[PDB]
Amino acid sequence: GAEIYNKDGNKLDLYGKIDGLHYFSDDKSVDGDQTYMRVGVKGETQINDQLTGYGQWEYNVQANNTESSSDQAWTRLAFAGLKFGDAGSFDYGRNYGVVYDVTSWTDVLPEFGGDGDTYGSDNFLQSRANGVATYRNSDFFGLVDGLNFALQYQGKNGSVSGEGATNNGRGWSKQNGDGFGTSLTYDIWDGISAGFAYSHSKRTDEQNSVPALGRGDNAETYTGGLKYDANNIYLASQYTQTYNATRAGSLGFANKAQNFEVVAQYQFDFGLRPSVAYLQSKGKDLERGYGDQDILKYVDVGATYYFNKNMSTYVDYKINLLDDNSFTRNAGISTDDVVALGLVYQF
Amino acid sequence: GAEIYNKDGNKLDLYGKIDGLHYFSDDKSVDGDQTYMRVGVKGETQINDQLTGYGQWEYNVQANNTESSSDQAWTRLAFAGLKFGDAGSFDYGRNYGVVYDVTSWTDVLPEFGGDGDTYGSDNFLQSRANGVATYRNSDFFGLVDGLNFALQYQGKNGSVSGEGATNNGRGWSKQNGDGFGTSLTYDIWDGISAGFAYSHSKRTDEQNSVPALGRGDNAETYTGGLKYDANNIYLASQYTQTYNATRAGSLGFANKAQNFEVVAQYQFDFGLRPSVAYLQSKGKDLERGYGDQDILKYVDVGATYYFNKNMSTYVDYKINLLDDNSFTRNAGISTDDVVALGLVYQF
Amino acid sequence: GAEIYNKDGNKLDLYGKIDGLHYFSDDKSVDGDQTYMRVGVKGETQINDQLTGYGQWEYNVQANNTESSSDQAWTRLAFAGLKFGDAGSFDYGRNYGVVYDVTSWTDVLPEFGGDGDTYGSDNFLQSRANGVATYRNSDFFDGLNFALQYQGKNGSVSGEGATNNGRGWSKQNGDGFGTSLTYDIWDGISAGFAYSHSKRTDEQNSVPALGRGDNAETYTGGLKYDANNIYLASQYTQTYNATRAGSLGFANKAQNFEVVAQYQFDFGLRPSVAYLQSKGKDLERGYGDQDILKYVDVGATYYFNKNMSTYVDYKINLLDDNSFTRNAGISTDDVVALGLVYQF
Q1: In angstroms, rounded to a whole number, what is the distance separating the alpha carbons of residues C162 and B330?
Q2: Contact state of A5 with C344 under an 8 Å Cβ cutoff
Q3: Which domains does chain B possess?
C-alpha cells in the first residue's frame, strides 16, 4: 500500500514493513533477536492505450545487529518491464523464478515456510534470482478465464574468477548456468486452483567440482500444486521433484530430491488466523556414504492476529522432526525446535 | 517532518537530514570529511478508539568515503508497537535504552556529545540497542500530569559463535546478556524537570575473557539528571555511575566509572544558538596497573544558526582536557582538540 | 523526479531508476547481468526572498548479485547548500568535481562513456568526489557560468597520510582546487574550459609503480551543439599525474579526447555514435607511450515516454592486447548492452 504519487498517468507506490521479531531456540545460530524491515517501490507509467511500463524494487534491511556490523542489507527485487494489455507482459531483472508461481501457495505460514526451507533464494528458478527474463500471459490471450502461463530464461551467473566467471560471480551454492522455466495455473472452480511448473538449468563446473555432493550437467524441477481458498478456509499443497537442484545444506546438492509442503488455515472474523502445516525434503543418492537423507522435516503450528491492514502480531512454533545425525551436523542443518513472536507494522 | 501519506487512518512521515560536515583535528582518525545523511519513516495506524499501532525506521548513510568502500550504511532504529491510550505503549525492535530518557537531556551540543562520549551505541541500555521490549507510560495513567516512566527488557545478544552465541552475534564491546531497565521523569513546572534511570544487565563470557579490563557478572547504571528549558534558556546536567558498563576504549570496561555532563545554551530571536558544555568520565579500579583513569574529559563551545526549521549551520569546538598517557594511547582514546563546521538540510 | 511533498515553502523530490541491463562480452569480468537501480531525494526550502536552502542525496543499489553478496550499495551524491537568489550558490558534501561541468557534455551515450572511461569517480575533481566545497555563479554578476571548488585531503587508511575517511591510493587526493567556465556563444552552441590542481599523497608516490609527482592537474576544453534535434559534443582534456593507468598507477601525462554525434527522431528513437581515447605518456617500467582507452561506440535508445526507455550500445574496442593492457588489467574486448529502464 501507500500511493505517494499519482499524476499525469504515472503512479508510485511505497510499501514495506517493520517486523519486530524474536526467535526462541536451543540452536544458537537461530535463537535471539530477528528484527528486520522491508521497503520497496512499485512504479507504473501509461505509455499508450495498449502499453504500460513498470518497475519494482524491494530491499531487505536487518535491524538485529550493531551499527558496525557488515552485510545487513540486500535487494530482493529489482526489475523493469512492459505490459501489452492482454497480449501479456515482459520484465527483466532480479525477480522470482516461475516455479514459485506454484510453490508460493504453501508459503503463507505466520513466519516460517517459503525460501530457506524446501528451496532457497539464488537457487536456479525456485525463488528470487539474478537476471531473469519473464514473459507472462493472462487468461490465455483473453480467451480462457483463469488460465495463466509464464515462460522464463535466465542467463549464466557463474564463478567470481577463472574459466566459469561472470561479472556478478558467487559461490557454487548460488551459481547457475543458462536455464529456462515455465509455469501454468488454472482456476478450475472459484476457490480451487491447480498448477504445474518445470525448470531446466545448466550447472556450472564449480558446482561439479568444489562440493562433494551432487553431480550432473543439468538441474531440473517438476512441480505440481493445489489450492483451496474460499469461505475463510485456506488449503494448499505443493509436491516438487528435483534433480541436482536442492541444496543438501552446506555440503552440496542432492542428486535427486522430493519436496512436500501442505498447509491449512482458517480466518475468523475478529482477525485471528490459525495455521498448521507439514514440510519435508527427502534427499536421494547422496555421495560420501550419505545415501538417502532427510534434508527438512517439520510440523508447524501458529497464528496471526490482524489488527487491520497495517498491523498484525503472530506466533509460530516449528516442531522439528529431524533426527540429529552426521549428515545434519556436517551439512549444518538445524534439528532443534523454534518459537517465534513478532509484531509487524506494514505500509 | 514531511507527511507524504495520510489516508483512511494511516499516516506516513518521511524524515531525515543531509549533513555537510568537516572535522579539523591533529587526530588523523577523526580529521577530514564527515558528510553523512539520515533517512527514515514514522508510520502510525489507527486500529480502534483505544488502540493505535506504529513503527519507525531510521537509517544512517555515510557519504564521506568512496563508492567501493565497505560498511557505509547502518540501521539506527527499527521498531513496531502498540499504543493503548493512557494505559501506556509497548514496542520491540532496535530502539533507545531507557537510560537515555535522562542522559538525552545533555545530548544537545551543536555536533559533539551523545553516543561515542560517556556512553555509546550497542552498550547495554545506555543508547540504541538490539532487541529491547519497552513499556512506556506518560502522565502516570492520565492521573499525574508530567510524570513519565518506562520499563524495559533486553534479550541476550551474544558472541558470533561458541557457547555464548546468538543469531546476531557481535564482538564483546557490543554484547549484552539478559537485562532490564527503568526510568522516571517528572515535570515540576512546564520548564523544569528531574529524572532518574536504572539498568541491570548480565555480562557475557567474552566480556570477561577477551579484554584485559573489566571483570564482573553484572552491568549496572544509576543516572540522575536535571533540566531547565524555557524562556529561551536551556540548562541541563546528568550524573551517571556505572559498574562494568562503561567502555575503557579498546581495552575493555571500567569496573566502575563516574560520568558527568552539563550544558548551557541560549536561543536568540534571529536564530543564533550558542552552547557551552563540559563532559567527563572518570574510571576507577582498572586492572593492569591503571587504577583510576580519565576516560573522557573536555570542554565544548559552539553555536548553531537556524535559517529556518529545515536548514541550519554550526560550529563546535571540543577543547580536549585529557593528558596523553599510557592508558589513553593503549585504549585508543583521542586527546586532541576538534573543530567542526557543518551545513544541514533537514526534511 | 516525482514531487512527493510541497508545503509551506518546502519541496521534496523523489527520483531514480530501475535499469534492467545485460552485458555481452568475452571479458568475463564485464559479461552477464548488470541490473541496478538508483534512488535519490532533492529537497528545497525557502528561507527568505534572497536565500534558499537545499540538499540532495543519490544512492546506487546493485541488483545483479545474491542476497548474501557484499558492498552492493553506495552513495553517489550527498550535499547541502545555499542559493543566494541569482547571485549563485555554495554547497558542501559528496558532489561532482567542476571538471565534469565540461566533460559532462560527452557523457550522453546510451550506456557506456562517462566515469570509468577517460576518468573515474573519486579521481581528484574529475567526477564525483568526497568533501568538495563548490561556489557557483550564473551570469557572472550574462549567460556565463563560473565555478570555484576546493577539496580537502582524502588520504590513507592509516599512517602519516591518514584521514578519517581513508581509502586506497587510486582514490586518494590531497588539498586541491578547481574552476570552470562555460558560455552559450550562440543559442545551441556552448564552449567550456576547466582547470584543476591537487596535491598528490605519499601513498600515490610510493605504492604504485606508475606515476610520480607532487601535484595533479587537468586542463579541459569542450564544445557542444544542441539544437534542431541534433546533439554534437567534444571534450579534450590534458592531465598530469591525474589519469589512471589501470591498476598500475597514474600516467605522468595523458591526453583524453571524447566526441559524440546523436539525432533525436520525433517518434522517440535516438541513434548515437561516439569515439573515445586516452593516450598515456612517459610511463615508468619501460611502458613509455601507451593507449589506456580506445573505442568507437554505436547504439540507440527508444524512449516510450519520459518514464520508460529501452537501449542497445555497442563498444567496439580498438585497443591492442599487449603487456601494458594485461598487467594493468585494461579490457580490450567488445561489449554489447541491452537494457530496459523505468525512471521516476
Answers
A1: 19
A2: yes
A3: 1-347 (2.40.160.10)
